[PDB]
Design a protein around this ligand. Structure first.
Ligand SMILES: C[C@@H](NS(=O)(=O)Cc1ccccc1)C(=O)N1CCC[C@H]1C(=O)NCc1ccc(C(=N)N)cc1
Ligand SMILES: C[C@@H](NS(=O)(=O)Cc1ccccc1)C(=O)N1CCC[C@H]1C(=O)NCc1ccc(C(=N)N)cc1
Ligand SMILES: *[C@@H]1O[C@H](CO)[C@@H](O)[C@H](O)[C@H]1NC(C)=O
Ligand code: NA
Ligand code: NA
Lengths: 28, 251, 11
């Protein structure tokens, strides 16, 4: 709950997945 | 998922597979929202027009998976269902309005690198992110084409579509408890959920707090990845009061 | 199509 939505292999280690930037770029 | 790609390891650690005990087969997708609660589409469990009415003992939940068909020893965890809760106003008769269900697990699942819950949106995050053109992400082990099946979990990013466009794409009555997503014919790019992706999550990564939120549940669509058609998703925030009521009462 | 799962989960 407290750490919901933070992925161990990505957000928790400050790594980005290959296409998340596509989402960010759409949030104009 | 049609016209998507293989997921990365641990890319969607809230992804759940609903698995039929006999015969052993994929039933639907779903998502992990806490150590004891799994969210899915009501039509995954109850759809009388197709003689579908699953009970707790018919099913298993498989969490932490990547491969569709393999038993992923030391990685996936398999859970039994304590109780299913279907929205009391789920409209299976007409248009799948309020297509949402919760499943309480018999025992809490241990979180790991591959198993971790997604957030549910609050009103503000929903208002900020559920806008035409903003993209979310759908994942699942469903069909690769409308009319085959993937080796591993598939992923596709898709833009939310303006409500009038959603409405004008179909003869079915759309409600405020649904939204639609996908590319338009003129946009070139494509992609869609499909049969078997049912019940899985449509997620968005908040640019405010860098957390993933589940905004939708794969609900319905006319075929898969057809030009001029869109995928329809249960609007999770609109039904959150019911979600909270169930968890508060039975959790 | 699917690999068999440990029997403990089917009990
Ligand atoms: C009565 C209604 N049946 S229905 O669409 O399957 C009902 C339904 C709608 C949305 C989600 C889940 C269930 C229907 O056939 N309608 C509603 C008004 C016009 C006509 C239609 O064109 N529906 C689209 C459609 C229907 C069936 C199928 C299919 N291959 N099963 C595909 C598209
Ligand atoms: C309205 C109806 N259309 S349908 O064309 O029959 C759905 C369908 C597509 C491909 C293979 C088998 C079924 C539908 O979507 N229904 C009827 C009752 C349950 C729901 C369903 O199948 N949902 C699964 C689903 C299918 C397609 C999509 C998509 N985004 N294209 C999403 C969910
Ligand atoms: C589905 O199964 C439940 C429990 O076995 C039953 O009570 C119900 O009447 C069935 N049909 C529904 C919910 O439409
Ligand atoms: Na219409
Ligand atoms: Na389309």
């Amino acid at each position: 709950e407290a750490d919901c939505g933070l992925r161990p292999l990505f957000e928790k280690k400050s790594l980005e997945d290959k296409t998340e930037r596509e989402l960010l770029e759409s949030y104009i | 998922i049609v016209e998507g790609s293989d997921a990365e390891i641990g890319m969607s650690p809230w992804q759940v597979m609903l698995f039929r005990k006999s015969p052993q087969e994929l039933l639907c997708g779903a998502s992990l929202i806490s150590d004891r609660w799994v969210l899915t589409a009501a039509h995954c469990l109850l759809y009388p027009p197709w003689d579908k009415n699953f009970t707790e003992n018919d099913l298993l939940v498989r969490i932490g998976k990547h491969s569709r068909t393999r038993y992923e020893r030391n990685i996936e965890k398999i859970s039994m269902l304590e109780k299913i809760y279907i929205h009391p106003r789920y409209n299976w008769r007409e248009n799948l309005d309020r297509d949402i269900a919760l499943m309480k697990l018999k025992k809490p699942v241990a979180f790991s690198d591959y198993i971790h819950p997604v957030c549910l949106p609050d009103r503000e995050t929903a208002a900020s992110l559920l806008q035409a053109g903003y993209k979310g992400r759908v994942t699942g082990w469903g069909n690769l084409k409308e009319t085959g099946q993937p080796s591993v979990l598939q992923v596709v990013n898709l833009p939310i579509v303006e409500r009038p466009v959603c409405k004008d794409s179909t003869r079915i009555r759309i409600t405020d408890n649904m939204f639609c997503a996908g590319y338009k014919p003129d946009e070139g790019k494509r992609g869609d959920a499909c049969e078997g992706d049912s019940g899985g999550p449509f997620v968005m990564k908040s640019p405010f707090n860098n957390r993933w939120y589940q905004m939708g549940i794969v609900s319905w669509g006319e075929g898969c990845d057809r030009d001029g058609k869109y995928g329809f998703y249960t609007h999770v925030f609109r039904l959150k009061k019911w979600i909270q009521k169930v968890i508060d009462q039975f959790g | 199509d699917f690999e068999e799962i440990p029997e403990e989960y089917l009990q």
